[PDB]
Amino acid sequence: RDNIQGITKPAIRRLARRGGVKRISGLIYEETRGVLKVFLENVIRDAVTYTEHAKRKTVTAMDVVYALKRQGRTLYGFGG
Amino acid sequence: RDNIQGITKPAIRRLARRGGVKRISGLIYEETRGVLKVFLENVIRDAVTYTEHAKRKTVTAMDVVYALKRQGRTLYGFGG
Amino acid sequence: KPHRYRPGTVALREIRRYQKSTELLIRKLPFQRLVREIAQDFKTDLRFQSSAVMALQEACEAYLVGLFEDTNLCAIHAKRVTIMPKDIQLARRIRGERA
Amino acid sequence: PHRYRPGTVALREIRRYQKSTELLIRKLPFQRLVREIAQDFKTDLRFQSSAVMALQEACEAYLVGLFEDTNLCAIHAKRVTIMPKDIQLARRIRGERA
Amino acid sequence: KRSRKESYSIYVYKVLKQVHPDTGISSKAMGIMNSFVNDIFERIAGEASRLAHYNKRSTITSREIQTAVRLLLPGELAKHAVSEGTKAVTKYTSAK
Amino acid sequence: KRSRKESYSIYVYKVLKQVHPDTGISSKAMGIMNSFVNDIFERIAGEASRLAHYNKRSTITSREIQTAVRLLLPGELAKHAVSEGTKAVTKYTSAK
Amino acid sequence: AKAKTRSSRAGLQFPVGRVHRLLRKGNYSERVGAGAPVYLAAVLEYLTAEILELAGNAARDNKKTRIIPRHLQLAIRNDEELNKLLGRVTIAQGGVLPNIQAVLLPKK
Amino acid sequence: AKAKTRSSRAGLQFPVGRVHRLLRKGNYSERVGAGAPVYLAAVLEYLTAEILELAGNAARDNKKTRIIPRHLQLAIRNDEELNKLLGRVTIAQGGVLPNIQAVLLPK
Ligand SMILES: [Cl-]
Ligand SMILES: [Cl-]
């Protein structure tokens, strides 16, 4: 469907909050959904390449880790 | 024991000019010299370390390169 | 009158709340549905280790939050308190994420 | 008595230097500064002429790019002059300080 | 009798005279091209290397080199690069 | 039963009990410690290797690991890591 | 006949053996010196403690026995050097340092 | 024995030999496929051509036949992808693309 809109206005708020933002423009929610999209896009691609090269049909925690590490964005706690 | 001050107001201006800056606070030149210091310091540290590990009393262009690369500040045309 | 807090007070309580906690701030399923969507653009009928979805949710939120942080500083830099697209935009331009 | 208004020679100097590629720092001052800074880390060190210029390239590149990032931070705050606080913002966002 | 430093400068010059037969190149610019080669050499050899490691493989094949290129290179450059890649390998296994 | 995934978690426990004998560690965090080790393994091994190659050595010595650590770790952290590293080497050599 | 584990010969809890293997099978080099793994397991142990120290504290401060990721996050982010080292590292269930920018706080 | 270079079986300039040797000597793996150094020397060639194409064009406009650094710079920063590729890459004697933010222009 169109699941990007499942990233609720309240959700993006909660995230701005943990980031230490007091006040939020209306325009932000769609810019945010905007950027999140490009993040998950660039990351999932490189993940699935790692899935594909491994000749699997199931994306493993490592695929995403290998991906995040690649993209500049290393993650601790899912292995590797 | 203060060559930093050799990096002349009119020179820092020439760099800012190529960088598309039109107007320059006085408080700037020092802050600049400041940043340059950290940047040179940072790189040469890692440079000389390359020099020391190769038991040489001469720092080589490649030392400077392996360093710039380490710092993610990768440089072309000196033996990359 | 019925009792009421003043614009920006609840926000600040909400900052303290969410900077104290670690729990993920996006709804699990909606995010999952989003992931599997953006996966169909690269291969169909894929599957995902439960753990691979979370590893992304932790990767996404962590990311956004740090953007908001760099954003909120570009708002404050323009004598504001309100984050606006042009603030994010400046972050990403300087971060070197766009041109 | 040909005089131009605060910012018109700037706009020219920008166009002159954006077009060329020569190094803008005088080279001796620069060379010395390096050795000054090398002392800190080891005494009686010698430098390949090319190693120096490689550092001058990197540095002049670094700064010019900062200035492009600084300059936007300035404009972001509805200004046209760059001020320490502009740089400070840039580097903080770039990930050069906390 | 000095060192014996290998460059790529003579493969740049060939390719250069395949794509702009009338035009030349300054040493400075050959320097740059040389670095360029080494830089993308390492990036692909590297990303291939991991590919291998992550799947428990002792061998880097063309297949690794491909996936590497796919990961490292942008949309269009990657498509074309995969093809000159896949083109060149076939032309090789045929030739002899 | 099942295949055998290695870790570092037992060596983290031992070091935790040496450092805070009255303290546990959640799975999720023990993961994060594992990741950490692994990350800083690959980083020191990597730069070690680069150092060897750059200088035409086929052998990664303690001397490389040391210089790796001096390049990767910041001032104070480096000093100590250099110290805890040298100490360990001396005490191993002298044992035979 | 009696085989003392190298880790013991270095007084390291980190497995100098498994480090030596991982290196040779890592494709880092053709040849690994025999001090190298020692030196590395050493440095690894050390930074493992350095974090487990400051975290181990963060846990007490919260009146918690077992260390959770967030203690690690508190530990790493507050110590200046560890934070520089894990500049580009994201820590699962780690949250952020409590920090509210001054100008946002109310006017007393 | 017949003389023929591998490069000249793949129909490449970029030396399939040197590459394969550089791969084994570089400590990337234990084992290297015969197809890799081809596929890699292929890809290295192709990118060398894309850059040298665009740059050659930049050297005309400047009225020049020899490429200088500046042409490469002009070539690369002007192409969206090449720029994406050489983001964190300084090009000595490159200079910057001409660019002046609107607000800094006079009415
Ligand atoms: Cl050794
Ligand atoms: Cl092959």
UniProtKB/Swiss-Prot annotation, chains A, B:
Q: Which residues carry this modification: N6-(beta-hydroxybutyryl)lysine?
A: 9, 55, 69
Q: Is DNA-binding there in the keyword field?
A: yes
Q: Which residues carry this modification: N6-succinyllysine?
A: 9, 55, 57, 69
| Effect annotated for changing residue 72 to R | Found in a patient with a neurodevelopmental disorder; uncertain significance
The compartments listed are: Nucleus; Chromosome
N6-lactoyllysine: which positions carry it? 9, 55, 69
Q: Which residues carry this modification: Phosphotyrosine?
A: 29, 66
Swapping residue 69 to E leads to an effect described as: In TEBIVANED2; results in severe early developmental defects when expressed in zebrafish embryos
Q: Which residues carry this modification: N6-acetyllysine?
A: 9, 69
Its domain of life?
Eukaryota
Residues recorded with modification N6-(2-hydroxyisobutyryl)lysine: 9, 22, 37, 55, 57, 69
A Gene Ontology molecular function term of the record: structural constituent of chromatin
Q: Which residues carry this modification: N6-propionyllysine?
A: 9, 22, 55, 57, 69
PTM annotation (Phosphothreonine): residues = 58
Q: Residues where N6-butyryllysine occurs?
A: 9, 22, 55, 57, 69
Alphabetized, the UniProt keywords read: Acetylation, Chromosomal rearrangement, Chromosome, Citrullination, Disease variant, DNA-binding, Hydroxylation, Intellectual disability, Isopeptide bond, Methylation, Nucleosome core, Nucleus, Phosphoprotein, Ubl conjugation
Family affiliation: Belongs to the histone H4 family.
Associated disease? Tessadori-Bicknell-Van Haaften neurodevelopmental syndrome 1: An autosomal dominant disorder with onset in infancy, characterized by poor overall growth, microcephaly, hypotonia, profound global developmental delay, impaired intellectual development, poor or absent speech, and characteristic dysmorphic facial features, including hypertelorism and abnormal nose. Other variable neurologic and systemic features may also occur.
**Name of this chain's protein:** Histone H4
What organism is the protein native to?
Answer: Homo sapiens
Instruction: Report the gene name.
Output: H4C1
Q: Which part of the complete protein is shown?
A: 24 to 103 of 103
Swiss-Prot record, chain C:
Residues modified as N6,N6,N6-trimethyllysine: 20, 43
Modification type N6-(beta-hydroxybutyryl)lysine: residues = 20, 43, 86
In the UniProt record, does the keyword Plastid occur? no
Q: Which residues are modified to Phosphotyrosine? A: 5
Example of a GO MF term: DNA binding
Q: Which residues carry this modification: N6-lactoyllysine?
A: 20, 43
Kindly list the biological process annotations in GO that this record carries.
chromatin organization; epigenetic regulation of gene expression; gene expression; nucleosome assembly; telomere organization
Indicate where the modification N6-methyllysine is found in the sequence.
1, 20, 28, 43, 86
The N6-glutaryllysine modification is found at 20, 43, 79, 86
Q: Which residue positions does Phosphoserine occur at?
A: 21, 50
Record bears the keyword DNA-binding: yes
* Principal subcellular localization: nucleus
Q: Where in the cell is it found?
A: Nucleus; Chromosome
Q: Where are residues bearing N6-succinyllysine located in the sequence?
A: 20, 43, 86
User: Residue positions of the PTM Phosphothreonine?
Assistant: 44, 71
* Positions of modified residues (N6-(2-hydroxyisobutyryl)lysine): 20, 28, 43, 86
Family affiliation: Belongs to the histone H3 family.
State what this protein does: Core component of nucleosome. Nucleosomes wrap and compact DNA into chromatin, limiting DNA accessibility to the cellular machineries which require DNA as a template. Histones thereby play a central role in transcription regulation, DNA repair, DNA replication and chromosomal stability. DNA accessibility is regulated via a complex set of post-translational modifications of histones, also called histone code, and nucleosome remodeling.
What is the recorded name of this protein?
Answer: Histone H3.1
- Provide the species name: Homo sapiens (Human)
First and last residue shown, out of the full length, are 38 to 136 of 136
Curated annotation (Swiss-Prot), chains E, F:
Q: Which residues carry this modification: N6-crotonyllysine?
A: 5
**Modification after translation (UniProt):** Monoubiquitination at Lys-5 (H2BK34Ub) by the MSL1/MSL2 dimer is required for histone H3 'Lys-4' (H3K4me) and 'Lys-79' (H3K79me) methylation and transcription activation at specific gene loci, such as HOXA9 and MEIS1 loci. Similarly, monoubiquitination at Lys-91 (H2BK120Ub) by the RNF20/40 complex gives a specific tag for epigenetic transcriptional activation and is also prerequisite for histone H3 'Lys-4' and 'Lys-79' methylation. It also functions cooperatively with the FACT dimer to stimulate elongation by RNA polymerase II.
Location (main, coarse) = nucleus
Q: Which UniProt keywords apply?
A: Acetylation, ADP-ribosylation, Antibiotic, Antimicrobial, Chromosome, DNA-binding, Glycoprotein, Hydroxylation, Isopeptide bond, Methylation, Nucleosome core, Nucleus, Phosphoprotein, Ubl conjugation
Record-listed cross-link Glycyl lysine isopeptide (Lys-Gly) (interchain with G-Cter in ubiquitin), residues: 5, 91
Could you tell me the superkingdom of the organism this chain comes from?
Eukaryota
Positions bearing N6-(beta-hydroxybutyryl)lysine: 5, 56, 87, 91
Subcellular localization, per the record? Answer: Nucleus; Chromosome
User: Which residues are reported to carry the modification N6,N6,N6-trimethyllysine?
Assistant: 56
Q: What does this protein do?
A: Core component of nucleosome. Nucleosomes wrap and compact DNA into chromatin, limiting DNA accessibility to the cellular machineries which require DNA as a template. Histones thereby play a central role in transcription regulation, DNA repair, DNA replication and chromosomal stability. DNA accessibility is regulated via a complex set of post-translational modifications of histones, also called histone code, and nucleosome remodeling.
Q: What is this protein called?
A: Histone H2B type 1-J
Curated annotation (Swiss-Prot), chain H:
Where does the protein principally reside? nucleus
In its keyword annotation, does this UniProt entry include DNA damage?
A: no
Give residues where N6-glutaryllysine occurs: 84, 107
Q: Keyword annotations for this protein?
A: Acetylation, Chromosome, Citrullination, DNA-binding, Hydroxylation, Isopeptide bond, Methylation, Nucleosome core, Nucleus, Phosphoprotein, Ubl conjugation
Residues with N6-succinyllysine modification? 84
Record localization: Nucleus; Chromosome
Spell out the post-translational modification annotation for this entry: It is involved in the initiation of both imprinted and random X inactivation. Ubiquitinated H2A is enriched in inactive X chromosome chromatin. Ubiquitination of H2A functions downstream of methylation of 'Lys-27' of histone H3 (H3K27me). H2AK119Ub by RNF2/RING2 can also be induced by ultraviolet and may be involved in DNA repair. Glutamine methylation at Gln-93 (H2AQ104me) by FBL is specifically dedicated to polymerase I. It is present at 35S ribosomal DNA locus and impairs binding of the FACT complex.
Q: Name any GO cellular component annotation.
A: extracellular exosome
Keyword DNA-binding belongs to the record: yes
| Modified positions (N5-methylglutamine) in chain numbering | 93
Q: Mind telling me where the Glycyl lysine isopeptide (Lys-Gly) (interchain with G-Cter in ubiquitin) cross-link is?
A: 2, 4
- GO biological process terms on file: chromatin organization; heterochromatin formation; negative regulation of cell population proliferation; protein localization to CENP-A containing chromatin
User: What GO terms are given for molecular function?
Assistant: DNA binding; protein heterodimerization activity; structural constituent of chromatin
According to the UniProt entry, which residues carry N6-(beta-hydroxybutyryl)lysine? Answer: 2, 25, 84, 107
> Where are the N6-(2-hydroxyisobutyryl)lysine residues found in this chain?
25, 63-64, 84, 107
N6-crotonyllysine-modified residues are where? 25, 107
State how it assembles. The nucleosome is a histone octamer containing two molecules each of H2A, H2B, H3 and H4 assembled in one H3-H4 heterotetramer and two H2A-H2B heterodimers. The octamer wraps approximately 147 bp of DNA.
Q: Which family does the record claim for this protein?
A: Belongs to the histone H2A family.
